[PDB]
Amino acid sequence: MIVPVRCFSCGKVVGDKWESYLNLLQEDELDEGTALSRLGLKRYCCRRMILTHVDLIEKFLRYNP
Amino acid sequence: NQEDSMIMNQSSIDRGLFRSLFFRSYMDQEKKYGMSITETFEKPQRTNT
Amino acid sequence: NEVFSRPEWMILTCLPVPPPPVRPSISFNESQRGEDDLTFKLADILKANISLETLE
Amino acid sequence: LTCPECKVYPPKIVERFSEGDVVCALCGLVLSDKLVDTRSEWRTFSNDDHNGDDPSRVGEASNPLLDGNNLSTRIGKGETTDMRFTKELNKAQGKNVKDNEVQAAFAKITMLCDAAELPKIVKDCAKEAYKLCHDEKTLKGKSMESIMAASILIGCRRAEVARTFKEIQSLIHVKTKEFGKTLNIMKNIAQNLTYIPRFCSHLGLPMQVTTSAEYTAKKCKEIKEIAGKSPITIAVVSIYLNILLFQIPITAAKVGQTLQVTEGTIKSGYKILYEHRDKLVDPQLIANGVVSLDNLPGV
Amino acid sequence: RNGPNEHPGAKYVIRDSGDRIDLRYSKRAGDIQLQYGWKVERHIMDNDPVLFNRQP
Amino acid sequence: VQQLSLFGSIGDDGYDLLISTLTTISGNPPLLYNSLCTVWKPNPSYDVENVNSRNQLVEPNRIKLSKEVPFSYLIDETMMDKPLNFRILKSFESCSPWSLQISDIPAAGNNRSVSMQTIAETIILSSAGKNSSVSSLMNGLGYVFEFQYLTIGVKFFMKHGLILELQKIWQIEEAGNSQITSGGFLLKAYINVSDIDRINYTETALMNLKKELQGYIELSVPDRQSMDSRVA
Amino acid sequence: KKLMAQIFFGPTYYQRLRHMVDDKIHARARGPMQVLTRQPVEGRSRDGG
RNA sequence: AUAUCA
Ligand SMILES: [Mg+2]
Ligand SMILES: [Zn+2]
Ligand SMILES: [Zn+2]
């Protein structure tokens, strides 16, 4: 839930890259592997951060108060 | 990491690896013991309690 | 054994009553009070006794 | 307890339960070492063990306030049991058994509360009112089904559970003047707002109507617009005013039916209140459909 | 002097008299002057022998 | 510092005999001395929690300031020209140096052969600045003047550091000084100890003095609670 | 310095389980006693022995 | 009393 700032393994900021990744997929139709790489996420530790994220926050927002 | 133990990247732990939230819930009733005796919600004073 | 165990002593005529330590009571909140199962079982023995005494 | 070394009048002492000690907070002298867990100790009397496997479970809780101190087990079937000896030892308990049987009048109160939808705190007050007045010479020879019908309104009038006397007249039984005198000799030893929730529910009105009727009725009394009419009538009348003011209306016949009042009587209170309808309503009431203060029936 | 909170510290002082001094609360936990024969209930320290066991 | 002591008393009439006895027993005649003590307590107007930075309980206590005064400040005109010796007692910019002391209630223990009190002391030598009066300085520490008393007496130096004081105490107030010791003298025997040995040795010295005066004047251990300056 | 061995390295899905040391750790040295037997009470919960 | 832990 909610994109991790910084990759656990090396600590490369990954907090900014979320919307940008989600955009390179809808708007650019691009496959996951290219979008990640476009965003400069080269090490698999960094790749796994975005590639395997589950943004549960968006469901959480669906409840009123 | 011998005999089923493991080593964790303390650096990763700081970055949020495996952290979790924890919520415990405590309950309490204000019970009524018959015609007169009733428990009360209040801050007890140490002289009369 | 003539001193410590005559056969006449197997049949109960008098009943040793154990003290509270063996059957503790607890006084909760004036409308709640807990007695030990033995204290219950004793009271039945007594009630049954008092009854049979009156009958004889 | 008071520290033998210090002795200050407010004896400031702590129960360090975790180390199982009772300490004097001032000098630090330990005043006691044997210390017992009362929660877990109470778990031995009132547990969840109904099967019989717990070795900790060794006693049972009783109620010295209601049934005095009558310790008594019951001969019943166990795992290895012949159905013969149970009968004999039970037929033998029959010869040893009057007032130890009038406790089945608690079963009359319990079956009346559950038929009247009454809480667990009301039964225990009705059972304590009945135990302390059923053998009185002040009640002497009152209708025995009307003295327990009076001790239920005595238990409701302390547990804050709104129950009119006509609500208990419907249960059992009640002879009105007979359980009305009995409700006073024991007493020596409702309002508009009470009915509004139920009547409204049966009426099928919205919260908005209920609240306004509730506000009007109180104001009616506050205003003293209805000199001595029964609260039930006042409430039914107020419900009429508010409801008529809103969209979903209810007629006198329908209100009276629910309130168990008569239209004529509701009319009586209603007209008395109507003159001050303006003062009566909640301030942010929204009259709807076509029913403003001017337009209300006025009947 | 170290007391119950510091590591190499102590919890109680047992006088000849038999009564236990709780260093956590005693107003005299500071100015506590020991006497031969008293007992200091001190923390477990490096190199104390202890029984270690794994059940069964 | 650890002060081991024993106390006693005598009425004015017992003076000469006691002086004569202590003079023979110690080998020296008495030495006249005085001291002014001012006691201070935490300002009641200010209030602070009673705990450490480590959140450990701290008990509020009084601070005692003590110094001497030239004898001439204690002799009026009626007192004029009277041998300045032991017999006189019968007819009864910056700050100066002071002794600052905070003491603890004596050590606990049933059947104590002597009183044993811990004393934290430091010395004030001088001051400077805006508010340099000892009074301001005490206030700066967060304390206020509570009370003060004058003590006049004679002392005897004995073996092993044992000291004996025969004293008279007067509380000082504008309303007047009242003699706390009215009637006689407060007798004090003590030794100041900066190892268990020297402590048991010191006890012995005091015990031998008590033993040597048994029958004549009795020296005992005062009540701990009477030697506790904590505020409460 | 390079390791003489080459390590099998890659991501693996690891789970965090309900058993954490701090909810387990327990120590006692004189404490609450039962009423009947006058022996140490039961369980970490009750500060048992 | 069920669930669970090695
Ligand atoms: Mg294992
Ligand atoms: Zn990375
Ligand atoms: Zn105390």
Side-chain angles (χ1 to χ4, degrees), chain A, chain B, chain C, chain D residues 1-11 13-33 35-78 80-82 84-90 92-97 99 102-107 109-116 118-119 121-136 141 143-144 147-156 158-159 161-166 168-170 172-176 178 180 182 184-186 189-299, chain E, chain F residues 8 11 14 27 29-30 42 44 60 70 83 97 106-109 120 128-129 140 142 153 161 175-176 183-184 189 205 215 222 232, chain G:
Chain A
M1 113 250 321
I2 223 287
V3 210
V5 188
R6 281 144 132 161
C7 154
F8 313 126
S9 311
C10 77
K12 207 298 126 282
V13 271
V14 147
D16 37 357
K17 285 102 185 154
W18 178 252
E19 299 164 282
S20 321
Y21 164 82
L22 248 43
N23 220 71
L24 283 158
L25 305 157
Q26 319 302 329
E27 274 213 272
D28 293 63
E29 298 124 64
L30 271 157
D31 61 304
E32 315 81 3
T34 320
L36 292 176
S37 267
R38 185 141 287 102
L39 291 141
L41 304 173
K42 101 117 197 203
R43 294 176 301 270
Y44 49 99
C45 63
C46 305
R47 305 190 116 258
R48 64 100 200 248
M49 221 61 53
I50 291 294
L51 181 64
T52 108
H53 179 53
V54 181
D55 206 62
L56 296 114
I57 177 147
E58 285 283 357
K59 305 236 154 52
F60 300 170
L61 296 168
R62 291 202 64 186
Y63 304 88
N64 284 288
Chain B
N1 66 325
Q2 256 164 119
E3 309 242 33
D4 294 3
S5 55
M6 65 227 245
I7 301 152
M8 260 225 191
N9 186 222
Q10 184 50 87
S11 239
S12 287
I13 313 156
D14 293 0
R15 275 163 218 134
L17 177 92
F18 285 110
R19 295 167 155 247
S20 74
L21 278 181
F22 176 71
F23 300 85
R24 160 169 263 116
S25 288
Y26 301 68
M27 208 248 305
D28 204 343
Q29 291 263 349
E30 215 177 40
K31 271 175 290 287
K32 288 187 174 283
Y33 290 116
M35 199 84 236
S36 46
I37 310 98
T38 303
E39 308 182 331
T40 309
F41 278 150
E42 50 153 316
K43 187 185 168 194
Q45 263 211 346
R46 239 178 190 100
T47 59
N48 73 327
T49 313
Chain C
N1 170 279
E2 72 155 17
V3 209
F4 314 112
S5 75
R6 282 177 163 264
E8 44 254 68
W9 303 332
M10 303 199 279
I11 297 173
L12 308 177
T13 286
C14 201
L15 219 56
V17 175
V22 182
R23 48 176 185 83
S25 112
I26 205 67
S27 58
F28 205 69
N29 272 338
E30 322 297 329
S31 76
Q32 286 210 295
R33 133 165 266 84
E35 285 296 341
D36 187 272
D37 279 15
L38 291 197
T39 305
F40 282 72
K41 208 63 256 176
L42 285 184
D44 279 294
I45 296 182
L46 208 47
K47 282 175 182 187
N49 193 78
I50 304 174
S51 188
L52 168 61
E53 166 238 342
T54 306
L55 275 115
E56 283 249 85
Chain D
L1 284 165
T2 275
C3 172
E5 287 185 322
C6 311
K7 283 180 184 192
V8 283
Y9 162 72
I13 72 138
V14 269
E15 178 194 310
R16 305 298 299 194
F17 178 80
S18 26
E19 297 66 67
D21 282 27
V22 194
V23 195
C24 176
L26 295 81
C27 75
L29 176 60
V30 69
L31 283 9
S32 169
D33 63 71
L35 202 147
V36 293
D37 197 316
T38 3
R39 307 299 284 175
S40 67
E41 235 74 41
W42 175 250
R43 198 73 114 90
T44 56
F45 297 97
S46 273
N47 212 333
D48 295 274
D49 192 83
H50 304 95
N51 184 24
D53 292 325
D54 204 348
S56 174
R57 149 132 284 201
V58 75
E60 243 208 355
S62 44
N63 207 323
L65 229 174
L66 296 181
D67 72 275
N69 53 346
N70 284 278
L71 301 317
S72 41
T73 82
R74 55 180 204 94
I75 301 89
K77 179 180 165 67
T80 148
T81 280
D82 184 18
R84 194 223 312 174
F85 306 121
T86 311
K87 292 173 191 166
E88 303 171 345
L89 297 175
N90 270 326
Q93 291 278 188
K95 321 288 184 186
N96 291 333
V97 166
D99 193 39
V102 192
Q103 47 75 31
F106 281 174
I109 294 180
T110 309
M111 202 164 303
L112 258 166
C113 297
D114 296 14
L118 244 33
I121 201 266
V122 163
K123 312 182 209 172
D124 296 329
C125 295
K127 290 192 196 76
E128 184 181 353
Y130 172 77
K131 192 183 179 192
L132 299 172
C133 265
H134 90 290
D135 203 44
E136 205 80 274
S143 300
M144 230 287 190
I147 103 277
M148 74 162 178
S151 71
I152 292 191
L153 204 145
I154 298 291
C156 280
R158 81 91 39 184
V161 180
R163 297 290 163 169
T164 52
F165 193 82
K166 253 193 62 183
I168 319 186
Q169 284 195 164
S170 297
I172 196 80
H173 57 292
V174 92
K175 289 277 215 315
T176 310
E178 147 70 37
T182 315
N184 200 275
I185 103 276
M186 289 186 172
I189 307 170
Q191 295 180 309
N192 60 293
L193 74 183
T194 191
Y195 303 98
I196 296 298
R198 295 185 294 99
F199 288 129
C200 294
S201 297
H202 294 87
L203 292 180
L205 292 173
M207 61 168 281
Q208 296 298 307
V209 176
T210 64
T211 300
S212 297
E214 183 170 328
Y215 282 105
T216 298
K218 65 159 30 180
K219 196 73 253 192
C220 180
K221 189 164 90 176
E222 188 174 334
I223 65 169
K224 192 164 180 176
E225 189 68 5
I226 291 177
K229 305 309 294 180
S230 68
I232 206 303
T233 197
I234 312 303
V236 57
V237 305
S238 295
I239 296 170
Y240 183 74
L241 185 70
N242 271 292
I243 194 159
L244 296 183
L245 279 176
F246 196 72
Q247 64 103 345
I248 63 166
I250 200 282
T251 65
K254 23 169 66 64
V255 66
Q257 293 180 185
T258 301
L259 289 80
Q260 295 180 359
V261 181
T262 189
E263 180 180 1
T265 55
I266 61 175
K267 165 73 169 294
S268 180
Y270 175 81
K271 72 284 185 78
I272 204 163
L273 289 63
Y274 177 79
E275 290 76 12
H276 294 273
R277 62 180 180 275
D278 293 355
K279 278 294 191 294
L280 299 180
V281 66
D282 57 310
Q284 294 74 239
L285 180 66
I286 180 167
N288 50 329
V290 178
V291 288
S292 296
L293 299 180
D294 297 298
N295 69 31
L296 292 81
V299 60
Chain E
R1 230 118 278 193
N2 266 80
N5 299 78
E6 253 73 86
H7 185 251
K11 293 171 86 165
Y12 292 93
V13 183
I14 303 110
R15 283 158 50 247
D16 28 40
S17 96
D19 228 327
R20 226 157 229 172
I21 301 156
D22 183 355
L23 301 178
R24 197 186 315 137
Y25 306 124
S26 174
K27 69 182 83 101
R28 291 201 49 171
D31 75 295
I32 191 112
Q33 235 315 268
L34 296 181
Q35 268 140 63
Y36 293 160
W38 285 14
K39 281 170 238 57
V40 167
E41 261 189 41
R42 56 142 249 254
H43 294 124
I44 278 340
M45 306 189 307
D46 278 57
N47 296 342
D48 281 342
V50 295
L51 225 233
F52 198 39
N53 144 64
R54 196 205 158 246
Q55 279 147 332
Chain G
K1 196 174 153 164
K2 283 187 196 140
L3 287 162
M4 199 54 112
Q6 303 97 85
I7 318 310
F8 182 74
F9 198 64
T12 304
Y13 197 76
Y14 259 84
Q15 300 179 288
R16 163 158 233 214
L17 305 144
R18 250 163 285 289
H19 318 279
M20 299 152 293
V21 70
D22 275 344
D23 326 290
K24 286 174 152 203
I25 183 156
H26 173 40
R28 141 116 171 198
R30 293 191 276 95
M33 302 292 166
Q34 289 157 50
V35 172
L36 182 69
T37 73
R38 294 206 198 182
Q39 253 176 69
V41 300
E42 229 200 319
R44 181 179 120 91
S45 31
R46 285 168 277 171
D47 185 40

Coordinates of all heavy atoms in Angstrom, one line a residue, chain E residues 35, chain F residues 5 107-116 220-222, unseen atoms left out:
Chain E
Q35 N 25.4 -4.0 56.0 CA 25.9 -4.6 57.3 C 26.3 -6.0 57.0 O 25.4 -6.7 56.4 CB 25.0 -4.5 58.5 CG 25.1 -3.2 59.3 CD 23.8 -2.6 59.7 OE1 23.0 -3.3 60.5 NE2 23.5 -1.4 59.3
Chain F
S5 N 28.3 10.2 65.3 CA 28.2 11.0 66.5 C 27.3 10.4 67.6 O 26.5 9.5 67.4 CB 27.6 12.3 66.2
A107 N 21.9 6.7 58.7 CA 21.8 5.3 58.3 C 20.8 4.6 59.1 O 20.7 4.7 60.3 CB 23.2 4.7 58.4
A108 N 20.0 3.7 58.4 CA 19.0 2.9 59.2 C 19.7 1.7 59.9 O 20.8 1.3 59.6 CB 17.9 2.4 58.2
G109 N 18.9 1.2 60.9 CA 19.5 0.1 61.7 C 19.0 0.1 63.2 O 19.2 1.1 63.9
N110 N 18.5 -1.0 63.6 CA 18.0 -1.1 65.0 C 19.3 -1.4 65.8 O 20.2 -2.1 65.3 CB 17.0 -2.3 65.2
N111 N 19.4 -0.9 67.0 CA 20.5 -1.1 67.9 C 21.8 -0.5 67.2 O 22.8 -1.3 67.0 CB 20.7 -2.6 68.2
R112 N 21.8 0.7 66.9 CA 23.0 1.4 66.3 C 23.7 1.9 67.5 O 23.1 2.4 68.4 CB 22.6 2.5 65.3
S113 N 25.1 1.7 67.5 CA 25.9 2.1 68.6 C 26.2 3.6 68.5 O 26.6 4.2 69.5 CB 27.2 1.3 68.7
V114 N 26.0 4.2 67.3 CA 26.2 5.6 67.1 C 25.3 6.0 65.9 O 24.8 5.2 65.2 CB 27.7 5.9 66.6
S115 N 25.2 7.4 65.7 CA 24.5 7.9 64.6 C 25.5 8.0 63.5 O 26.7 8.4 63.8 CB 23.9 9.3 65.0
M116 N 25.1 7.8 62.3 CA 26.0 7.9 61.1 C 25.4 8.7 60.0 O 24.4 8.2 59.4 CB 26.5 6.5 60.6
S220 N 23.9 9.2 73.8 CA 23.1 8.3 73.0 C 22.9 8.6 71.6 O 23.3 9.7 71.1 CB 21.8 8.0 73.7
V221 N 22.3 7.7 70.8 CA 22.0 8.0 69.4 C 20.7 8.6 69.3 O 19.7 8.1 69.7 CB 22.0 6.6 68.6
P222 N 20.7 9.9 68.7 CA 19.4 10.5 68.5 C 18.5 9.9 67.5 O 19.0 9.1 66.7 CB 19.8 12.0 68.2

